[PDB]
UniProtKB/Swiss-Prot annotation:
Official protein name in the record: Non-receptor tyrosine-protein kinase TYK2
Family: Belongs to the protein kinase superfamily. Tyr protein kinase family. JAK subfamily.
Part of the intact protein present: 580 to 868 of 1187
Description of post-translational modifications: Phosphorylated.
Modified residues (Phosphotyrosine): 25
Upper taxonomic lineage: Eukaryota, Metazoa, Chordata, Craniata, Vertebrata
Length: 258
């Protein structure tokens, strides 16, 4: 159950990057500013999972969830059409602007992200790809008199269909119980994303090889506590290996607002 987008209705512009089994381009939709996520040549089950993401994210709404417009099926190309959010991914922005972003700014985006994930929890819908790359900046909020505004993008190809190798590369955003689907995984993803934001877009463990990322989870080592000193109790509660011990998003949002 998703919108079929006819190929006459879209224009493809420049290449922005590569997502999980995708090439991502800027585009136009007749007009709206969009991103075009072109799937790799794939087995039908990967294409199904791609369609499933588009279907689920088409039937939810939130101020801090980016729009999904539909899928264009050119034969045998599959292209998801989604919102272009003006200032792009949070991780790249933070790295370019590092040492100019105050703590108070970071508290605002954490609250906004927790709001969106509170709604998804209430809807009992798994995201499965909460990370800096999928947080998009609609307003910058650094100028005097302003505050930032973010949007969480769709998860792309559903986590359930990816290979073990791909799951290892998503450490430490990936919930440990997903290494060998519940809404509990998104608590861990959220916690990992808060560390990423606090470290100015440098996630922990990203200078290490895949086998060393996996080994860290095998031993069950505890991730570092944030440079944002207020957040430490919260990130550690989110990043606990036992999923049932992680707090609800009602509790997370409540604690962040004060």
């Amino acid at each position: 159950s998703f919108h079929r987008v006819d190929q006459k209705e879209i224009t493809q512009l420049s290449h922005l990057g590569q997502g999980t089994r995708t090439n991502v381009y800027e585009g136009r939709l007749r007009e709206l500013r969009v991103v075009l996520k072109v799937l790799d040549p794939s087995h039908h089950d990967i294409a199904l999972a791609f369609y499933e993401t588009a279907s689920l994210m088409s039937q939810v709404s939130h101020t801090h969830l980016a729009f999904v417009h539909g899928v264009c099926v050119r034969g045998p190309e599959n292209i998801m059409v989604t919102e272009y959010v003006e200032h792009g991914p949070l991780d790249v922005w933070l790295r370019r602007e590092r040492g100019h972003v105050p703590m108070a700014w970071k508290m605002v985006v954490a609250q906004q992200l927790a709001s969106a994930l509170s709604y998804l929890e209430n809807k009992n819908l798994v995201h499965g790809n909460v990370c800096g790359r999928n947080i998009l900046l609609a307003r910058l909020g650094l100028a005097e008199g302003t505050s930032p505004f973010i949007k969480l993008s769709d998860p792309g190809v559903g986590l359930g269909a990816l290979s073990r190798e791909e799951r290892v590369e998503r450490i430490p955003w990936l919930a440990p119980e997903c290494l060998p689907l519940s809404t509990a995984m998104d608590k861990w993803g959220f916690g990992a994303t808060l560390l990423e934001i606090c470290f100015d877009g440098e996630a922990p463990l990203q200078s290490r090889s895949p086998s060393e990322k996996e080994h860290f989870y095998q031993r069950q080592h505890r991730l570092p506590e944030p440079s944002c000193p207020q957040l430490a109790t919260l990130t550690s509660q989110c990043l606990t290996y036992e999923p049932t011990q992680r707090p609800s998003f009602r509790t997370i949002l409540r604690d962040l607002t004060r």
